[PDB]
Amino acid sequence: RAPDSVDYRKKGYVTPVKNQGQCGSCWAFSSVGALEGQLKKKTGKLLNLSPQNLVDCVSENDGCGGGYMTNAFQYVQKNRGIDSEDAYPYVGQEESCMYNPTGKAAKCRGYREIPEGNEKALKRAVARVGPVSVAIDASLTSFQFYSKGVYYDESCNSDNLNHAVLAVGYGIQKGNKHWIIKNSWGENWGNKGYILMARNKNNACGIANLASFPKM
Ligand SMILES: *[C@]1(O)CO[C@H]2[C@@H]1N(C(=O)[C@H](CC(C)C)NC(=O)c1ccc(-c3csc(N4CCN(C)CC4)n3)cc1)C[C@@H]2F
Ligand code: NA
């Protein structure tokens, strides 16, 4: 059995909260967050990886028009690397691919998709692998104005995924099981950039429907 609670913020696996701006690069932030966790586990060092590298260079995605995290991990593998944020900084608009192997800060040997809808498998992956890339329905006004507590809205649509975020842990708050979710809308959004989302509540907001992690 996995631990009852896991919080990778407490383990030094999670970089500061970023702000993607208007660019539809949620997928790229979700992807780099999962890579950053694996890089810390493998090398002992926490550093910011480049979402702009992904935006500009993953041709299977649509840059600031959106993308998938699976395609991002596939690119890092096929490309034999991803650059650091410092080497390839975020500008929030699409530009020509500027990937440089001199700035390479991580590699990827593959990825794994979590079995669809399986929150227990997602829990075990978070516990035993690290932070996991996830997609959710973030379209409700109640999500937009999240402040505190465990987020649950009966109107959330588990069949309508429209945002990519990072599951950095899980636990329980006053009896309500949750996922600890890192967003990419700045520290001013939510609770210092984070939201606790209902866990084991009928796959609320589709949290386990499009989850994946990279391998290093
Ligand atoms: C996030 O910033 C949240 O708001 C934005 C952005 N979104 C996404 O990235 C979502 C995330 C999923 C639900 C995990 N993804 C998409 O909406 C998405 C995925 C793929 C594509 C795609 C790939 S190739 C391609 N095109 C279209 C255009 N033609 C000319 C070339 C190929 N499109 C697009 C969008 C959701 C929201 F967009
Ligand atoms: Na692909």
From Swiss-Prot:
**Main localization (coarse):** other
Active-site residue list: C26, H163, N183
Gene Ontology BP, a term: thyroid hormone generation
Q: Which cysteines are joined by disulfide bonds?
A: C23-C64, C57-C97, C156-C205
Which keywords has UniProt assigned to this entry? Cell membrane, Disease variant, Disulfide bond, Glycoprotein, Hydrolase, Lysosome, Membrane, Protease, Secreted, Signal, Thiol protease, Zymogen
The GO terms this record gives for MF are: collagen binding; cysteine-type endopeptidase activity; cysteine-type peptidase activity; fibronectin binding; proteoglycan binding; serine-type endopeptidase activity
Q: What is its EC number?
A: 3.4.22.38
Which organs or tissues contain this protein?
Predominantly expressed in osteoclasts (bones). Expressed in thyroid epithelial cells.
Q: Name one GO cellular component term.
A: intracellular membrane-bounded organelle
What class does this enzyme belong to in the EC scheme? hydrolase
What is the membrane topology noted in the UniProt record heading this document?
Answer: Peripheral membrane protein
Q: Which reaction does it catalyse?
A: Broad proteolytic activity. With small-molecule substrates and inhibitors, the major determinant of specificity is P2, which is preferably Leu, Met > Phe, and not Arg
Localization: Lysosome; Secreted; Apical cell membrane
The protein's job, in short, is: Thiol protease involved in osteoclastic bone resorption and may participate partially in the disorder of bone remodeling. Displays potent endoprotease activity against fibrinogen at acid pH. May play an important role in extracellular matrix degradation. Involved in the release of thyroid hormone thyroxine (T4) by limited proteolysis of TG/thyroglobulin in the thyroid follicle lumen.
Q: Which family does it belong to?
A: Belongs to the peptidase C1 family.
Linked pathology is: Pycnodysostosis: A rare autosomal recessive bone disorder characterized by deformity of the skull, maxilla and phalanges, osteosclerosis, and fragility of bone.
Q: By what name is this protein known?
A: Cathepsin K
Name of the gene: CTSK
Task: Tell which residues of the whole protein are contained here.
Answer: 114 to 329 of 329
